[PDB]
Short mmCIF file of C-alpha atoms and ligand atoms in Angstrom, two decimals:
data_model
loop_
_atom_site.label_atom_id
_atom_site.label_comp_id
_atom_site.label_asym_id
_atom_site.label_seq_id
_atom_site.Cartn_x
_atom_site.Cartn_y
_atom_site.Cartn_z
CA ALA A 1 -24.24 10.27 8.61
CA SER A 2 -25.68 11.96 5.50
CA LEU A 3 -24.52 11.86 1.87
CA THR A 4 -23.01 15.37 2.11
CA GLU A 5 -20.97 14.11 5.08
CA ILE A 6 -19.83 11.04 3.11
CA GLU A 7 -18.60 13.36 0.35
CA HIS A 8 -16.65 15.21 3.05
CA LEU A 9 -15.29 11.84 4.19
CA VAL A 10 -14.19 11.00 0.59
CA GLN A 11 -12.38 14.31 0.12
CA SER A 12 -10.77 13.92 3.57
CA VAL A 13 -9.54 10.36 2.99
CA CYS A 14 -8.20 11.45 -0.36
CA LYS A 15 -6.51 14.45 1.24
CA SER A 16 -4.85 12.39 3.99
CA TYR A 17 -3.59 9.96 1.40
CA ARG A 18 -2.10 12.73 -0.74
CA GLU A 19 -0.32 14.19 2.29
CA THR A 20 1.11 10.75 3.26
CA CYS A 21 1.76 8.99 -0.05
CA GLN A 22 5.54 9.21 0.40
CA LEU A 23 6.33 9.98 -3.25
CA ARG A 24 4.25 11.91 -5.75
CA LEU A 25 2.75 9.74 -8.51
CA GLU A 26 4.04 12.41 -10.92
CA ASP A 27 7.70 11.78 -10.04
CA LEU A 28 7.25 7.97 -10.01
CA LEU A 29 5.88 7.93 -13.58
CA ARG A 30 8.59 10.30 -14.82
CA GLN A 31 11.32 8.04 -13.45
CA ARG A 32 10.02 4.94 -15.26
CA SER A 33 12.61 5.77 -17.93
CA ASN A 34 15.39 5.66 -15.31
CA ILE A 35 16.40 1.98 -15.00
CA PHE A 36 19.33 0.36 -13.16
CA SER A 37 22.13 -0.76 -15.52
CA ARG A 38 23.32 -4.41 -15.58
CA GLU A 39 26.32 -3.35 -13.49
CA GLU A 40 24.11 -1.65 -10.94
CA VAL A 41 21.96 -4.81 -10.70
CA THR A 42 25.16 -6.85 -10.12
CA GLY A 43 26.16 -4.34 -7.41
CA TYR A 44 22.92 -5.10 -5.53
CA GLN A 45 23.30 -8.88 -6.10
CA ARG A 46 26.76 -8.89 -4.57
CA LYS A 47 25.73 -7.35 -1.25
CA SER A 48 25.21 -9.82 1.58
CA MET A 49 21.73 -10.79 2.62
CA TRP A 50 22.57 -8.74 5.76
CA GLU A 51 23.17 -5.47 3.93
CA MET A 52 20.14 -6.04 1.64
CA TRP A 53 18.02 -6.90 4.69
CA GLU A 54 19.12 -3.72 6.45
CA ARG A 55 18.30 -1.48 3.48
CA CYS A 56 14.97 -3.20 2.74
CA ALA A 57 13.96 -3.19 6.42
CA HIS A 58 14.71 0.53 6.45
CA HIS A 59 12.52 1.24 3.39
CA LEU A 60 9.78 -0.96 4.77
CA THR A 61 9.81 0.69 8.22
CA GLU A 62 9.68 4.08 6.53
CA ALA A 63 6.68 3.03 4.39
CA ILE A 64 4.86 1.68 7.46
CA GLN A 65 5.40 5.03 9.22
CA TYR A 66 3.59 6.82 6.32
CA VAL A 67 0.75 4.25 6.66
CA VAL A 68 0.45 5.00 10.40
CA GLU A 69 0.35 8.75 9.55
CA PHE A 70 -2.38 8.10 7.00
CA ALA A 71 -4.47 6.18 9.57
CA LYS A 72 -3.96 8.87 12.20
CA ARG A 73 -5.58 11.40 9.83
CA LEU A 74 -8.62 9.20 9.12
CA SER A 75 -11.89 10.39 10.66
CA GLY A 76 -12.63 8.68 13.94
CA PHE A 77 -9.38 6.63 13.92
CA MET A 78 -7.93 8.83 16.71
CA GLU A 79 -11.25 8.46 18.58
CA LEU A 80 -10.75 4.69 18.84
CA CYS A 81 -9.12 3.41 22.03
CA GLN A 82 -5.38 2.90 21.91
CA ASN A 83 -5.78 -0.91 21.87
CA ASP A 84 -7.92 -0.88 18.72
CA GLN A 85 -5.71 1.66 16.95
CA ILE A 86 -2.80 -0.72 17.55
CA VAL A 87 -4.79 -3.86 16.60
CA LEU A 88 -5.88 -2.32 13.30
CA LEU A 89 -2.40 -1.09 12.29
CA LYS A 90 -0.69 -4.35 13.33
CA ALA A 91 -3.00 -6.47 11.12
CA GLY A 92 -3.37 -3.96 8.27
CA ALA A 93 -0.28 -1.72 7.86
CA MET A 94 1.74 -4.23 5.78
CA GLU A 95 -1.26 -4.91 3.60
CA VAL A 96 -1.47 -1.11 2.93
CA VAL A 97 2.27 -0.99 2.08
CA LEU A 98 1.78 -3.74 -0.50
CA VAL A 99 -1.21 -1.97 -2.13
CA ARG A 100 0.74 1.35 -2.24
CA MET A 101 3.68 -0.37 -3.95
CA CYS A 102 1.66 -0.70 -7.19
CA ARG A 103 2.07 3.05 -7.86
CA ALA A 104 5.86 2.49 -7.96
CA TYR A 105 5.66 -0.61 -10.18
CA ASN A 106 5.96 -0.57 -13.99
CA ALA A 107 4.09 -3.51 -15.54
CA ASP A 108 5.51 -2.82 -19.01
CA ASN A 109 8.86 -4.24 -17.86
CA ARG A 110 8.05 -5.74 -14.41
CA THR A 111 10.26 -3.27 -12.51
CA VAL A 112 9.86 -1.39 -9.25
CA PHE A 113 11.16 1.94 -7.98
CA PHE A 114 13.97 1.22 -5.55
CA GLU A 115 16.47 3.72 -4.14
CA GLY A 116 16.23 6.22 -7.00
CA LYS A 117 15.84 3.96 -10.08
CA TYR A 118 13.65 1.15 -11.47
CA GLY A 119 14.77 -2.48 -11.14
CA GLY A 120 13.39 -5.97 -11.62
CA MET A 121 13.00 -8.68 -9.01
CA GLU A 122 16.57 -9.94 -9.59
CA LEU A 123 17.87 -6.82 -7.76
CA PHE A 124 16.76 -8.58 -4.52
CA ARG A 125 18.60 -11.85 -5.18
CA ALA A 126 20.90 -11.79 -2.08
CA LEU A 127 17.84 -11.92 0.21
CA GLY A 128 17.31 -15.52 -0.93
CA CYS A 129 13.49 -15.18 -0.87
CA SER A 130 12.59 -15.30 -4.54
CA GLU A 131 9.13 -16.85 -3.93
CA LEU A 132 8.27 -13.93 -1.66
CA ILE A 133 9.59 -11.22 -3.98
CA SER A 134 7.97 -12.83 -7.02
CA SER A 135 4.63 -13.03 -5.19
CA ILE A 136 5.01 -9.35 -4.24
CA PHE A 137 5.76 -8.41 -7.87
CA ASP A 138 2.90 -10.55 -9.21
CA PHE A 139 0.43 -8.87 -6.84
CA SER A 140 1.58 -5.40 -7.97
CA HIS A 141 1.25 -6.71 -11.56
CA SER A 142 -2.41 -7.69 -11.11
CA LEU A 143 -3.23 -4.38 -9.32
CA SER A 144 -1.53 -2.33 -12.03
CA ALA A 145 -3.86 -3.89 -14.60
CA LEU A 146 -6.75 -2.00 -12.94
CA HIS A 147 -5.06 1.42 -13.34
CA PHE A 148 -5.98 2.44 -9.80
CA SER A 149 -6.43 6.18 -9.48
CA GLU A 150 -4.84 7.86 -6.45
CA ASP A 151 -8.31 8.34 -4.88
CA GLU A 152 -9.25 4.62 -5.42
CA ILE A 153 -6.04 3.61 -3.55
CA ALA A 154 -6.80 6.12 -0.77
CA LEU A 155 -10.31 4.75 -0.24
CA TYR A 156 -9.42 1.09 -0.75
CA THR A 157 -6.51 1.31 1.75
CA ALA A 158 -8.67 3.16 4.28
CA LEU A 159 -10.88 0.00 4.09
CA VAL A 160 -7.96 -2.43 4.36
CA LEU A 161 -7.24 -0.68 7.75
CA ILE A 162 -10.72 -0.02 9.11
CA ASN A 163 -11.90 -3.58 9.38
CA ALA A 164 -14.03 -4.61 12.36
CA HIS A 165 -13.32 -8.32 11.86
CA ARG A 166 -9.72 -8.11 13.11
CA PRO A 167 -9.45 -10.30 16.25
CA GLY A 168 -8.68 -8.58 19.58
CA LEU A 169 -10.79 -5.46 19.01
CA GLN A 170 -12.40 -4.12 22.19
CA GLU A 171 -14.82 -1.52 20.75
CA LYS A 172 -15.92 -3.55 17.69
CA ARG A 173 -19.14 -1.50 17.21
CA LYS A 174 -17.18 1.78 16.83
CA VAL A 175 -14.88 0.30 14.15
CA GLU A 176 -17.93 -1.10 12.35
CA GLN A 177 -19.49 2.36 12.23
CA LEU A 178 -16.34 3.78 10.70
CA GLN A 179 -16.07 0.82 8.28
CA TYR A 180 -19.69 1.20 7.00
CA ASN A 181 -19.26 4.89 6.33
CA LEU A 182 -16.00 4.24 4.42
CA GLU A 183 -17.69 1.40 2.47
CA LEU A 184 -20.44 3.77 1.37
CA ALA A 185 -17.86 6.51 0.68
CA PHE A 186 -15.99 4.06 -1.64
CA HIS A 187 -19.18 2.84 -3.46
CA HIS A 188 -20.46 6.38 -3.80
CA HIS A 189 -17.19 7.71 -5.21
CA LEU A 190 -16.97 4.86 -7.73
CA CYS A 191 -20.47 5.74 -8.88
CA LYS A 192 -19.46 9.46 -9.17
CA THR A 193 -16.46 8.43 -11.32
CA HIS A 194 -18.10 5.57 -13.36
CA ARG A 195 -15.62 3.12 -11.88
CA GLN A 196 -18.13 0.66 -10.36
CA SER A 197 -16.38 -2.10 -12.41
CA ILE A 198 -13.26 -2.18 -10.18
CA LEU A 199 -15.28 -3.68 -7.29
CA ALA A 200 -15.39 -7.15 -8.95
CA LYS A 201 -11.73 -6.82 -9.98
CA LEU A 202 -10.36 -6.25 -6.44
CA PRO A 203 -8.05 -8.82 -4.76
CA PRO A 204 -10.21 -11.64 -3.32
CA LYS A 205 -10.57 -11.13 0.45
CA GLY A 206 -7.77 -13.13 2.08
CA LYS A 207 -5.25 -12.82 -0.79
CA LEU A 208 -3.71 -9.66 0.67
CA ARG A 209 -4.11 -10.99 4.23
CA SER A 210 -2.25 -14.27 3.52
CA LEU A 211 0.51 -12.64 1.44
CA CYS A 212 1.42 -10.52 4.48
CA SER A 213 0.92 -13.46 6.91
CA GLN A 214 3.82 -15.63 5.68
CA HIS A 215 5.75 -12.38 4.96
C1 DGX B 301 10.02 -16.69 5.50
C2 DGX B 301 11.54 -16.90 5.50
O1 DGX B 301 12.20 -15.62 5.37
C3 DGX B 301 13.63 -15.51 5.58
O2 DGX B 301 13.99 -14.13 5.82
C4 DGX B 301 13.08 -13.13 5.31
C5 DGX B 301 12.24 -12.49 6.44
O3 DGX B 301 13.06 -11.88 7.44
C6 DGX B 301 11.31 -11.42 5.85
C7 DGX B 301 12.17 -10.40 5.10
O4 DGX B 301 11.34 -9.36 4.57
C8 DGX B 301 11.95 -8.56 3.55
C9 DGX B 301 11.24 -8.92 2.24
O5 DGX B 301 9.86 -9.08 2.59
C10 DGX B 301 11.43 -7.88 1.13
C11 DGX B 301 11.18 -6.46 1.64
O6 DGX B 301 11.53 -5.53 0.60
C12 DGX B 301 11.20 -4.16 0.85
C13 DGX B 301 11.93 -3.27 -0.17
C14 DGX B 301 11.43 -3.56 -1.60
C15 DGX B 301 9.90 -3.34 -1.75
C16 DGX B 301 9.54 -3.83 -3.16
C17 DGX B 301 9.13 -4.18 -0.69
C18 DGX B 301 7.61 -3.87 -0.72
C19 DGX B 301 7.32 -2.37 -0.59
C20 DGX B 301 8.08 -1.54 -1.65
C21 DGX B 301 9.60 -1.84 -1.57
C22 DGX B 301 10.42 -0.97 -2.57
C23 DGX B 301 10.16 0.51 -2.27
O7 DGX B 301 11.00 1.34 -3.08
C24 DGX B 301 8.66 0.87 -2.47
C25 DGX B 301 8.27 0.76 -3.95
C26 DGX B 301 8.48 2.30 -1.87
C27 DGX B 301 7.56 3.26 -2.59
C28 DGX B 301 6.23 3.32 -2.48
C29 DGX B 301 5.70 4.42 -3.29
O8 DGX B 301 4.51 4.65 -3.43
O9 DGX B 301 6.71 5.13 -3.81
C30 DGX B 301 7.95 4.39 -3.53
C31 DGX B 301 7.96 2.10 -0.42
C32 DGX B 301 7.97 0.59 -0.15
C33 DGX B 301 7.77 -0.03 -1.56
O10 DGX B 301 6.38 0.16 -1.85
C34 DGX B 301 9.68 -3.93 0.74
O11 DGX B 301 11.98 -6.25 2.81
C35 DGX B 301 11.69 -7.09 3.92
C36 DGX B 301 12.55 -6.68 5.12
O12 DGX B 301 12.87 -11.08 4.05
C37 DGX B 301 13.84 -12.03 4.54
C38 DGX B 301 14.61 -12.64 3.36
C39 DGX B 301 14.14 -16.30 6.80
C40 DGX B 301 13.50 -17.70 6.85
O13 DGX B 301 13.97 -18.47 5.74
C41 DGX B 301 11.96 -17.58 6.81
O14 DGX B 301 11.35 -18.88 6.93
#
C-alpha cells in the first residue's frame, strides 16, 4: 500500500466508527449534567441480581453488536475467512466495548451513562461484583485522562481487533497485512495531529486482554 491509500484507510476507519459508535459523543457530553438522584440509585440497588443481570446483559449484547458492525466495515475484514473473522471478534469484541465505554464516562465525578442518565459504580450493587465494576470504572478513568479523540478511539479499536497473534487463526499472514497497514495508519494520523505522545500512554499490552479474560 501507499501513503495516499493509508490516508484513505484512516478516513474509512474513522467513518465506520462514526456510523457504529452507538451514541453521538455530542449527546453523551450534554447529558453529563443529567445524574441519577439518590432515590433512583436506591431503585437500581433494590433490583435482584437477576433483573440487573438481564438489563446489563442486554446493554452489553447491544454494544457488542455495534462492535461487530464496526469490524464488518473495516477494509479487508470481510475478505478474511469466516473462521478468522469469528476468532478475531471472539477475542477482541469485549475489549473494544471497554475502550468505547470511556466516551460515556465522566471522570469529574466517576459516573457512567446508563439507561438515560449518569450514575456511579454503586448503581450496580445488586450484581455483587464490585471488584469487576470498580476495575471497569478505573480503566475508563485512566483512558479518560488521555482525552481520546473520536478518531484515536476508531483507530486504536481497529487495532485491538485486527491482531494476528490471536490463537486459532488460519490465515495469519492476511491478518498481519491488515494489522501492519492499520498500525501505520494510526502512527501516521498521530503525526498529522501532533498526538504522537498518546502512544506511550496507552494501556500496557495485556491489561485490556486480562480485564476481559476474568470478565
Ligand atoms: C466472575 C464471577 O461473576 C459472577 O457473575 C458475573 C458474571 O456473570 C459476569 C457478569 O457480567 C456483567 C458485568 O460484567 C457488568 C456488565 O455491565 C454492563 C452494563 C454497564 C456498563 C458500564 C458495562 C461496560 C460497558 C458499558 C456499560 C454501560 C453502558 O451504558 C455503556 C456506557 C454504553 C455506551 C457506550 C457509549 O459509547 O455510549 C453509551 C454501551 C456499553 C457501555 O459502554 C457493561 O454486565 C455484564 C453482564 O457479571 C456477573 C455479576 C458469578 C461468579 O461469582 C463468577 O465467579
